[PDB]
Each structure stands twice: as structure tokens, then as C-alpha cells.
Amino acid sequence: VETFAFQAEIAQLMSLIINTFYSNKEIFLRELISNSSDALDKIRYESLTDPSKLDSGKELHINLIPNKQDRTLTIVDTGIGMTKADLINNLGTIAKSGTKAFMEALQAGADISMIGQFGVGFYSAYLVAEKVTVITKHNDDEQYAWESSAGGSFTVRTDTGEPMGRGTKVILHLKEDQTEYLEERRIKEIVKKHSQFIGYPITLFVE
């Protein structure tokens, strides 16, 4: 297991997300679904010129998997996935420069719900999760698990568990007081409210 320090700006963003009073937590789901949609767009585009890139799975979709026993909500996509380098590099995002822009917007009347406009929506996961585990498989690499409970560090290891094929799973280990996000009716409500027109099928798994 390798342990890495977050860039200072990202550590600061995560503390802001964790510590700022902000009731509208439900937007985390919209942000993660948007990220999945972006990853699916990428593999779709690459597959246009090289169809073999779908050998690892032709279906382009998103699964939402609640598990009350483990207190987890998992967002799964069959998008492009991430290399080990991608994972370490802030999960393929421009998080350092994005955090700066986001910080400035906040000082200029922006609110936390606009986090996605700055390419750092992933970190909104920490509105509801005490720990986030990201399992990922890119065509060009092995399967990895990224993990962080904030506090300034994240880990990366190879993942020998259930091979995925291609894509990314974001596993939200929910805070004790945020279990509403495991209820079917609540998840449906949030998807309809914020993610109604996503261009890929979203399947909400049943318990």
C-alpha cells in the first residue's frame, strides 16, 4: 500500500467541504454522476476510431448501489477508467487549479453547489462520506483501489478483488447521520431532481 499526501490546495478544499456548514449535501450525487458521464463520454469518443477499446465492455452506463449493511453507496460507471498515474494525479482532474478558481468564486458569492463548475466535484463526496474508496480499471493498466478518509493523505494499492472490466466505482462510506442516501425513495428523488437528463442509463439497485 502506497501513501500519498494531497496537494495543499486539495487538502484545504477537503477540509472546507468537511467543516463548512452547508445543508444542501445531496448535490454530491449529481457531481459523481456527472463525473461518470464525463468518463463515459471519453470511452465513447475513443471507441469511435478504435472499436477494440470496448472489448472490455460495450455497455456504457451507471449503476447506483446502496448497501445498508455496509452503510455504503457506490456509484459505478463503465467509463474510460483511470491509470495508476491518473489516480495519483487527483483522479484525472485539474484539482489544484480548479480548487483555486473555486476558492475565489466562494469569496465572490458562490456556494458549494457550484463546485462542479471548477472540475473538483469529486470532493463533494466528503459532504456525506467519512471514507471514499475508488476502484478503477483503464484499458491500459491494472485494477487499482484509491482510498482516503481525508486528513491530508490518500492511499493507492492494486485491487485483486472482483475484476471490473473497465470503468470506475466510487464507494462512499457514509457518515452515521447521512444514511438517508441509502433509501431508495431518497436516491430516486435526487436523481430526478439533479440528474434527469444524463445521456446514459442509470440503474438504481434494490436491496
Interacting residues with ligand FJ4 (CB under 6 A): 32, 35-36, 38-39, 42, 77, 79-82, 91-93, 122, 168, 170
Q: How far is the CB of 168 from ligand FJ4 (least distance, A)?
A: 4
Q: How far is the CB of 143 from ligand FJ4 (least distance, A)?
A: 13
Asked whether residue 77 is marked as a ligand-binding residue, the answer is yes
Asked whether residue 70 is marked as a ligand-binding residue, the answer is no
Residues in contact with 206: Cβ distance below 8 Å, sequence separation at least 6, in sequence order: 184
Residues in contact with 104: Cβ distance below 8 Å, sequence separation at least 6, in sequence order: none
Q: How far is the CB of 199 from ligand FJ4 (least distance, A)?
A: 14
| End-to-end CA gap in the chain | 32
Nearer to ligand FJ4 by Cβ, of 35 and 139: the residue is 35
Beta strands (DSSP E) in 17-166 are: 62-67, 72-77, 129-137, 143-148, 153-158
Nearer to ligand FJ4 by Cβ, of 65 and 185: the residue is 65
Among 178, 205, 176, CA closest to 62: 205
Asked whether residue 35 is marked as a ligand-binding residue, the answer is yes
Asked whether residue 38 is marked as a ligand-binding residue, the answer is no
Nearer to ligand FJ4 by Cβ, of 21 and 127: the residue is 127
Euclidean distance between CA atoms 34 and 121, whole angstroms: 8
Q: Alpha helices of 20-116 — where are they, by DSSP H?
A: 27-49, 84-88, 95-107
Q: How far is the CB of 186 from ligand FJ4 (least distance, A)?
A: 20
Q: How far is the CB of 109 from ligand FJ4 (least distance, A)?
A: 26
User: In angstroms, what CA-CA distances link 52 with 47, 49, 57, 154, 163?
Assistant: 7, 9, 10, 33, 19
Binding residues for ATP, by number, are: 35, 77, 96, 122
